Write a protein that binds this ligand. Sequence first.
Ligand SMILES: [Fe+3]
Ligand SMILES: [Zn+2]
Ligand SMILES: [Zn+2]
Ligand SMILES: [Zn+2]
Ligand SMILES: [Zn+2]
Lengths: 172, 172, 172, 172
Amino acid sequence: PSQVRQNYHQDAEAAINRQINLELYASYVYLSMSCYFDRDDVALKNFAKYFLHQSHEEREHAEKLMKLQNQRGGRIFLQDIKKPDRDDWESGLNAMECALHLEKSVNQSLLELHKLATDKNDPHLCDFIETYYLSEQVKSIKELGDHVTNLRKMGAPEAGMAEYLFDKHTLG
Amino acid sequence: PSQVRQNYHQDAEAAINRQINLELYASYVYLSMSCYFDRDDVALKNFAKYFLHQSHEEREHAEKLMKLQNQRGGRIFLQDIKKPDRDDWESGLNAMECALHLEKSVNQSLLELHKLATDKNDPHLCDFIETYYLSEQVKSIKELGDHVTNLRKMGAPEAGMAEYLFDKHTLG
Amino acid sequence: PSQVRQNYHQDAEAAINRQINLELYASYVYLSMSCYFDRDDVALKNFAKYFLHQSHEEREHAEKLMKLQNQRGGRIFLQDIKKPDRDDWESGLNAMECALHLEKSVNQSLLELHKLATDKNDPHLCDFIETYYLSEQVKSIKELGDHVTNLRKMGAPEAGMAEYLFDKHTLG
Amino acid sequence: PSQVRQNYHQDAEAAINRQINLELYASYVYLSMSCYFDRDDVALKNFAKYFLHQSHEEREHAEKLMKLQNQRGGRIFLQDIKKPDRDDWESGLNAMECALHLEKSVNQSLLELHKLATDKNDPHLCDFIETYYLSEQVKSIKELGDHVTNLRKMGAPEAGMAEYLFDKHTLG
Ligand SMILES: [Fe+3]
Ligand SMILES: [Zn+2]
Ligand SMILES: [Zn+2]
Ligand SMILES: [Zn+2]
Ligand SMILES: [Zn+2]
């Protein structure tokens, strides 16, 4: 038992390691999206910048969880970061929809984590998740949903100027 | 009789209280519109900001009338603020048209107020309405009419990019 | 179902709309108080400023709840804002006592909201209420109780100089 | 007929000269009050400063009317400035009450002036009175009424500390 460990159940430790892997996976998905918008046959620089920023933020989310694990006396166990589900994201709209789907999955994992921490009466972990993760995810889900709504309304992907003007105004 | 009261007829007092209720109602209508444009399936941030600003301005219009009432020795009598006529405003264009209709109704109430004050030979009240209310309403009616013209001309609500580009250029 | 909605029960949505109506009502009560202290036969400018500030803060509390509702994929349903229970608040002390009573009622509604959100396992909503509403209400209840204690101790409303000197020192 | 005179009836000219005399009289009343509060057996410096400021403002009101008369091609005819009704004003409260009475009389003369100008279809004169005189008088009446309310509530003149603390806080 670690000298610092107190009120930190092994199941919470395991769940945090699973959450760290999920955050790194999301970063890598966002990186793939960012790479796709940089292709010469896609050529949407603002979409590329948006998703690269999202990748870096998710890397920060993972590192903050690692700090939490070490702070509570648990031991980080890293696992393979699986490749994203596709290399061709097909459009700005499609990419935003997939990012929405991803963000809601991460949100769902965090809610399961919070329920475990509440079941284990770990108040510190609950408040950590509440303060640094759940509100951020709610904001990001709302942002992505707004992006999808606007793109769909503009006629994306079929209306040729829709992704181009969205890239300039909203993401520029 | 209030120690300050002079040349201030009870009918004018009643009309001012009615005007205060109308100004608060308009604020609450604008608030509902603002809430509608913030929905994830509408997602027009500049329309939301515009109508929230309008709500705050109408709240200021009401409070200025309350100050007038107290200044003249009349007594403020507040009434229920009725809910707006709808929660779904259906489009930017529709919202602007309804706001135009509302602004002209408020204008019509103020003109009736000015006619009453002229009939009662209350010069101070007439000049107050003229200086702080009628010109503002004329400017706001003209602004909203211009907004409606531009949106209709752009093809709103059916042309998908019309509300989006109006939100960025005119209201941004 | 809204594209952003996740772990947000319809009962919580309804309770938030009820909370929005309660916050707007409180703003309107504070506005009426503010109007009363501005009367020429009351003439307590600092009491008027205090309650007007309180009205604006409660309007901000309502708008923050509206933002929450839209963020979680729920739909705002506005209701009539009922008029305050009286137009004559009779004294500074009486007004402070009524404001204390109001603040504790709002607090009681928020605690019921938090209990519902805990029953529904909605951690985000619980933390939102905890972070932005409950502590503010505790501070405001304590402030108002202190104001009442000081006014009662000074001999208000019967001691003529008590409300006057409280208006200058504490609220000035 | 003056080369500049246009739409300026002789009755309006006479009424303006009467108004100029009334404004100078009010200045001289305020001066007498100011002198009274400077007496060694009264010794209320802030009451003295208040009424001296009021005297200077009324002198400015008279001079603005003189400018109006010359601007419209009328001829100023000055009359004796009658002495104030008393040299002993007996208290701060009594002085404020008399000032309220004076301000309302001046207000009543201005409303009669506005009615004459409206009967004579002199829009410029009406707007001049409305813009520079009626609103100022409404503000001053409300201020004096508030002062009287506060002094009466504090127990003035019988409560010894009431005029002293009002002089420091409100008029200081
Ligand atoms: Fe003191
Ligand atoms: Zn994350
Ligand atoms: Zn208005
Ligand atoms: Zn509140
Ligand atoms: Zn004057």
